[PDB]
């Protein structure tokens, strides 16, 4: 959830934000 | 501790996976170049592409009661195929 996969993880973050 | 050094002698080889996959690919690629009357037969006769095992009389009613002219057509297919037409790609699996 950081560095490289930061971006993918925050995608997942605002996906959960987005349901 | 001795638990490490044992081997797991059951499962699988991705190398042999590639082997058999390229094989079966060539198999059906070869079966593509066959008689349509017989193509069906050769599929169902051995259970290719199915969970099935059909060999006999049921075929006799679905298609034609004839049974041993089918054998003559086995000889046919060998002649169509074996005489160096497509043998060469099999012979790489001869070493199997």
């Amino acid at each position: 959830p950081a560095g490289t996969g930061y971006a993918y993880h925050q995608d997942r973050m605002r996906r959960r934000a987005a349901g | 501790h001795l638990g490490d050094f044992i081997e797991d002698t059951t499962l699988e080889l991705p190398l042999d996976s590639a082997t058999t996959e390229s094989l079966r690919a060539a198999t059906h690629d070869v079966l593509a170049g066959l008689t349509a009357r017989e193509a069906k037969v050769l599929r169902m006769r051995f259970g290719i592409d199915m969970n099935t095992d059909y060999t006999l009389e049921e075929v006799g009613k679905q298609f034609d009661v004839t049974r041993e002219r089918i054998r003559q057509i086995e000889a046919k297919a060998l002649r169509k195929l074996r005489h160096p037409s497509r043998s060469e790609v099999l012979r790489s699996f001869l070493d199997d």
């Binding site: - | 082997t19 390229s22 790489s92 699996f93």
Partner: protein, 251 residues
């Protein structure tokens, strides 16, 4: 592998016993031979590999190009105890490497060992090339010093050259530049650690990142004069005006 030096190498380079990569880069070249179709099937690929065809090696050099690699000594105590270099192949069972980075490894050519891992995925390939490419990491993140300090021999030969006897010969003449001093020294005519007058032409980005050209004289050692030649075009000669302690090289 056991590990030896590559002195002549460049930063990106690493010696590589080819059979190591051979073993390691198997499915690459198998896909490549089904692509070419010399080894149409895979069993043919195996026994052809087993023949040692020259094309095996031609292809292997073909693939190994631009396929970066990892580098591991133990203890990987801090981050720099492993690195990532470009491959280069060698006729032996002895990895070479760029010597200066014994520092980060604290390593030495006395029986040490190293091990390797593979950037298979392109993501790893590019991670490597952008992050653990040695260009990336040359100051410690802890403190701001270079970690590629020239260690023992280089610094000493340097101290030898950039040096000012009074003794040897060839004192109090004039040159246009270091090239003819090389003509002398490689013809073998002058002392090299010997203060003598000559001109230089240095630079400076005093303008807004724009070099400022000018030339003038210095009564400098022949060695220091020659050693100017490598300077990349920003710098004074006062900086090169001493026998260059190891701390000097650092600064």
């Amino acid at each position: 592998s056991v590990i030896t030096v590559g002195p002549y190498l460049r930063l990106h380079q690493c010696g590589l016993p080819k059979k190591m990569a051979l073993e390691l880069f198997k499915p690459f070249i198998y896909g490549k031979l089904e692509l070419r179709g010399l080894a149409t099937t895979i069993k043919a690929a195996k026994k052809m590999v087993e023949r040692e065809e020259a094309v095996v090696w031609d292809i292997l050099d073909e693939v190994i190009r631009e396929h970066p690699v990892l580098l591991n000594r133990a203890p990987t105590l801090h981050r720099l105890g492993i690195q990532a270099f470009e491959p280069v192949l060698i006729e032996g069972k002895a990895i070479q490497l760029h010597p200066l980075v014994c520092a980060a490894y604290n390593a030495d050519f006395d029986g040490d060992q190293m091990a390797v891992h593979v950037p298979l995925t392109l993501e790893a390939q590019l991670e490597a090339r952008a992050l653990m490419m040695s260009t990336n990491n040359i100051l410690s993140p802890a403190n701001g010093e270079p970690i590629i300090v020239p260690s023992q021999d280089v610094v000493l030969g340097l101290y030898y050259m950039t040096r000012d006897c009074v003794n040897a010969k060839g004192e109090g003449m004039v040159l246009t530049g270091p090239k003819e001093a090389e003509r002398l020294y490689r013809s073998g005519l002058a002392s090299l650690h010997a203060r003598v007058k000559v001109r230089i032409t240095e630079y400076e980005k005093d303008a807004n990142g724009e070099l400022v050209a000018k030339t003038s004289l210095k009564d400098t050692t022949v060695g220091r004069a020659i050693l100017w030649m490598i300077v990349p075009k920003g710098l004074p000669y006062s900086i090169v005006n001493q026998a260059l302690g190891k701390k000097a090289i650092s600064k």
